[PDB]
């Protein structure tokens, strides 16, 4: 309870950690830790009744977030781990269920079968891109195919529990916590041309409430980079 | 020199042999290894993780997220079937395209046990009871709540626990995992009554898979380019 | 019976991945294959259950010939010899059947006469990185990943022939060795559409029935 990091403080009360490993350290690279280790809280998304899902590309959401977004421009390479806190606050009169996965190398598909989706359609800067419950037509040239039952990657959405995940059931649970290590084939990679993580939040059982209750449930995502180091002089 | 004698089957190409082979590029000094998290040593580790089962196909929920949700409402009948699906292997059933059933379609012979986890995704103020009957292979499906109680069953109280685990063998009639209303869903004022139920599947013990084959779910007519 | 599901007994098999024809006198006739795993749909689905792979490689070529209709007057040809050149990533590439890129020293070739055992050859793990990558969420054009590049193969006749046209086929067999796999991935549901990217058309989750009960 009441964990602090740098000059930020959140409050909590189980934790699922990666593939069983903790984020650790490795010309010569430098290690900044007072610069990055703090809780970057993104803005809240509203879970309505006819909602479908959200996704964040992970070293893209913190690309304009203060001093972590400055070291991405100055230094060429870099590796980092993350610690994601997802928590939605609803009463005991609401009902629903969420799945919070964290997909490494989630390559997505376009709506037209011959093209590839453009840069502004994969990730918005610290803003949630959202799934849909219908198809995107082939007349649109460069748009991401956002059928939620295929999860944008052409795979079954029920089989997404093979990744490090956590269920949020509003009857019994309120929060999720994921600790992700650095997963890549090279030890250091460029942070603008590669998004090696993707945080998806998909409602399997939709939100329901009676008349009088609040018609939304806000979801708050909090990301903190752990054990980051960059390559430079 | 040394006298040798070539046996039959000498200058042939059997596609499943294991011989030494001359390297095209020696003296290359390949890249050494690196600790990457999450190494897979056996394909059974993919089958032992849970995955949601689409029990609610019903011809127009297969292209939605409504396939995974089992509807539960407060009705006026005294004893009524919620769902039911056989454990017949591969014959267009609900455990076919799940994370377990995509591995068992790569092999010909398999036998083991199955975990079946349920989860009540309703409000925290709703209370009810469900039967979880299991028919063995050979026995018929129960047509009533009473003779489903006379078999093997687990009474699942929603107000106490929100998840029920049901271990069961599955081997390549083969069984039924039918479920029945015991009591109705009692709910307070200003709480919705129509709730949902999710269902999971896994591998309880270690299976024994044998005689690898190709999957029936993928085919191509002309080389991708 | 728990060992046939290991990574070595699952992926180390043989598979026909390419099939091409070439003749001798067309002055356009030679074969070409860029080494990838994304051409056939049954090997692609097995290698895409994992994100990062690392394997050696072993190739076997099955070469047959056939006599094309010549003019007349007693076609009698000797045995035929073929050249199978392997170009590493970042090497010269032939454009004609008679070129300077066939005779270069750093492109290892095999020479094989007909009527013998087929010409196997083996390629180690060549990459700058530490593993191959089946999926790449990033730009180089989206999702190409120029780091897993295995090279190109070229095939031709080395016999000059005038009395009779002869065309030949070749089937390339693919077999990974010493396989290591990381970060598992769910199996692909929709059908494959293109080779380079992960484009698809949306399909239903499973086959449907008439009732829930």
């Amino acid at each position, epitope marked *: 309870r009441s964990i602090t990091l740098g000059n930020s403080t959140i409050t909590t009360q189980n934790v699922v950690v990666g593939y069983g490993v903790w984020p650790e350290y490795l010309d010569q690279p430098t290690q900044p830790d007072v610069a990055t280790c703090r809780f970057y809280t993104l803005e809240s998304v509203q879970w309505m009744k006819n909602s479908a899902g959200w996704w964040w590309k992970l070293p893209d959401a913190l690309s304009q977030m203060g001093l972590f977004g400055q070291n991405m421009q100055y230094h060429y390479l870099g590796r980092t781990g993350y610690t994601i806190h997802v928590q939605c606050n609803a009463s005991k009169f609401h009902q629903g269920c969420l799945l919070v996965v964290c997909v490494p190398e989630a390559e997505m598909g376009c709506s037209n079968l011959n093209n590839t989706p453009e840069f502004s359609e994969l990730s918005g800067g610290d803003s949630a891109r959202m799934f849909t419950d219908t198809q995107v037509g082939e007349s649109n040239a460069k748009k991401v195919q956002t059928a939620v039952w295929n999860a944008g990657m052409g795979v079954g959405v029920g089989n997404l529990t093979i990744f490090p995940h956590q269920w949020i059931n509003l009857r019994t649970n309120n929060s999720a916590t994921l600790v992700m290590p650095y997963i890549n084939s090279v030890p250091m990679d460029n942070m603008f041309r590669h998004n090696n993580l993707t945080l998806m939040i998909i409602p399997f059982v939709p939100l329901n409430y009676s008349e009088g209750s609040s018609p939304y449930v806000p979801i708050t995502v909090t990301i903190a980079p752990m054990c980051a180091e960059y390559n430079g002089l | 020199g040394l006298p040798v004698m070539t046996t039959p089957g000498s200058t042939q190409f059997l596609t499943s042999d294991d011989f030494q082979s001359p390297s095209a590029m020696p003296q290359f000094d390949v890249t050494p290894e690196m600790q990457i998290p999450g190494r897979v040593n056996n394909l059974m580790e993919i089958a032992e993780v849970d995955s949601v089962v689409p029990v609610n196909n019903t011809e127009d929920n297969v292209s939605s997220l409504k396939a995974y949700q089992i509807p539960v409402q407060s009705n006026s009948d005294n004893g009524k079937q919620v769902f039911g699906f056989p454990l017949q292997p591969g014959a267009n059933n609900v455990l076919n395209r799940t994370l377990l059933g995509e591995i068992l379609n790569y092999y010909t012979h398999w036998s083991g046990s199955i975990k079946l986890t349920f989860m009540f995704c309703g409000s925290a103020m709703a209370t009810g009871k469900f039967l979880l009957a299991y028919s063995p292979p050979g026995a018929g499906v129960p047509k009533n709540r009473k003779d489903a109680m006379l078999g093997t069953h687990v009474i699942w109280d929603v107000g106490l626990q929100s998840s029920c685990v049901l271990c069961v063998p599955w081997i390549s009639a083969a069984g039924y995992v039918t479920c029945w209303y015991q009591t109705n869903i009692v709910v307070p004022a200003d709480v919705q009554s129509s709730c949902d139920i999710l269902c999971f599947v896994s591998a309880c013990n270690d299976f024994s898979v044998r005689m690898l084959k190709d999957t029936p779910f993928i085919r191509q007519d002309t080389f991708y380019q | 019976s728990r060992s046939e599901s290991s990574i070595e007994n699952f992926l180390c098999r043989s598979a026909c991945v390419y099939y091409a024809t070439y003749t001798n006198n067309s002055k356009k006739g030679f074969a070409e294959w860029v080494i990838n795993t994304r051409q056939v749909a049954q090997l692609r689905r097995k290698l895409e259950l994992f994100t990062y792979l690392r394997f050696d490689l072993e190739l076997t070529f099955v070469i047959t010939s056939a006599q094309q209709p010549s003019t007349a007057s007693s076609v009698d040809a000797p045995v035929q010899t073929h050249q199978i050149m392997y170009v590493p990533p970042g090497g010269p590439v032939p454009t004609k059947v008679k070129d300077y890129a066939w005779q270069t020293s750093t492109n290892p070739s095999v020479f094989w006469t007909e009527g013998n055992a087929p010409p196997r050859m083996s390629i180690p793990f060549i990459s700058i990185g530490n593993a191959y990558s089946c999926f790449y969420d990033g730009w180089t054009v989206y999702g190409i990943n120029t780091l897993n590049n295995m090279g190109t193969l070229y095939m031709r006749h080395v016999n000059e022939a005038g009395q009779g046209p002869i065309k030949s086929t070749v089937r390339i067999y693919f077999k990974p060795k010493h396989v290591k796999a990381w970060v598992p991935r769910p199996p692909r549901l929709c059908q494959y559409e293109k080779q380079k990217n992960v484009n698809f058309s*949306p399909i239903g989750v499973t*086959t449907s029935r008439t009732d829930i009960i």
Partner: antibody
Amino acid sequence: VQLQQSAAELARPGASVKMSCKASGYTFTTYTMHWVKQRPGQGLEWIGYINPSSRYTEYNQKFKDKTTLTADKSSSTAYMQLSSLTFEDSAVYYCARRSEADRFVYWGQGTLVTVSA
Amino acid sequence: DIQMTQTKSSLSASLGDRVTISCRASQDISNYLNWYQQKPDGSVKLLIYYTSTLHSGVPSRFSGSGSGTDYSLTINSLEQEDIATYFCQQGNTFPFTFGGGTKLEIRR
């Protein structure tokens, strides 16, 4: 492995027809089914397709306000209804099955639609 | 839309010669072309599903080439059953546009 269409039709101008294309030999709800119109004085022309799993249709811009493509899972057919029939709608209509995103591997034999009085 | 233009629309050649049918697009379609063959009874089938890649079950007398805008189809040994109509279809952009026909017949 083949596709089978209906027989030839005949309709007055202003009336409506409905063709069909029965698929057999493969799983019907996997591949999309397209429709091609060939007037006898010109080449082929694309109309639209239907995804038989989610019943999602997408038409060409010239054929949007007239045609309507439906399907059914039981009989494994794919219908097409032409509305507001005019004199230039007299052609031969094919049904094709697209695989690998550009190739039309299997075709039908085509139905001849004629308008007269 | 990409206008696939076949400017010949009629070829005349005897048995056993080499025929060449050309199909020219409007802009670059980047090697995404298919060649179909329509028999005079109405049956259509796919011949070459790329610029030069033959479909399985097609005799080896057919071959294709081209790059960029111009493409071609080559039958070096004309047979009796090769008298049909040939189309070019691009698969690059939306929607799919087919080319005009090309009817073959004997010279004299």
